Design a protein around this ligand. Sequence first.
Ligand SMILES: Cc1cc2nc3c(=O)[nH]c(=O)nc-3n(C[C@H](O)[C@H](O)[C@H](O)COP(=O)(O)O)c2cc1C
Length: 362
Amino acid sequence: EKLFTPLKVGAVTAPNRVFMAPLTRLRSIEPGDIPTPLMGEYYRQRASAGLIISEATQISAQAKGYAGAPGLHSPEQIAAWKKITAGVHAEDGRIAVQLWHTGRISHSSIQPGGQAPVSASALNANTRTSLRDENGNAIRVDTTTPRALELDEIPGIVNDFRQAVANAREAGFDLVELHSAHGYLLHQFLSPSSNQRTDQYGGSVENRARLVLEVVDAVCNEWSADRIGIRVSPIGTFQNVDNGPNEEADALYLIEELAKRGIAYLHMSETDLAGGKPYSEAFRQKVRERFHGVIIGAGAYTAEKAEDLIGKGLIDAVAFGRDYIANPDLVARLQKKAELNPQRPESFYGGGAEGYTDYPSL
Ligand SMILES: Cc1cc2nc3c(=O)[nH]c(=O)nc-3n(C[C@H](O)[C@H](O)[C@H](O)COP(=O)(O)O)c2cc1C
């Protein structure tokens, strides 16, 4: 077993390879989309993780797509996150903030001015997002048809990612993870199914990957390459957004480009929660030879699958999502081969302490 051995991830060193995947829990304070003391406790309980990747966090108010999701834009949010990272560090843990712009996966009622959300093209995601009712309870709602950005708006998007990263550094995060997966803004440009642009940000894969690569360069220039991670879901269909008829080739192109920046890590979300086709060991090898940094695998990993792939040298770490939701001390449990607490899906989104901080440790 090598799942419990140290691993250098960019500027930091994780004592084990059991990572906590980014998990949207929608328990932030509104107004302000502010992280809470309860959230700090939740993250503190899970500090033994090799690395904690936070719930998706807004790089701007416009980036908001879910009620209850935190932001990292505004004095109050920065101050709130500072206490959370301090708590994790007090337990000697490491935490990375996942930054996103939901793009078309949003609703007008939570956008600035109540206006239509933005995207690569004006195509409704044909899905739903999570809002809050009159009592603050989480509820589902169809996504609002988006507005195609506009050429001169792109620089502003890259700037928002850069500023959020600057705030992240100030906030005490050890690393940042760009969310270019699961059909959110960056993925919306990457995919031809959601990108019908005729300017230089649409068409060829090079054009579709232009925005994400501009963000990587910008955040890398703002902080440091060894502080930047990125999550992608380039194979399969995620939240109604597929990856095109040449997804494999297009994925390898993107990874070679990311590699040139020498960033901290490549986080691959291998399948949608609804399932998907498995990654062949051949493809994993092709990814392996193209990226020279840490590679994190995620999906429906069992400790056994992780040990097998890490042992084949195809990946370096594994991010567990749901098991981490139900087991703050997942590291200890997996190492001791103990039983895990059962999961309570009903309380994954919204609410309070129940189903959040009440999962006991051994
Ligand atoms: C409650 C819930 C919320 C999630 N929120 C996020 C998130 O904020 N960002 C992200 O990239 N993926 C998110 N995911 C995906 C997880 O990080 C993870 O990849 C997924 O749960 C599959 O892994 P698992 O089988 O180990 O849980 C979410 C999944 C769940 C069930």
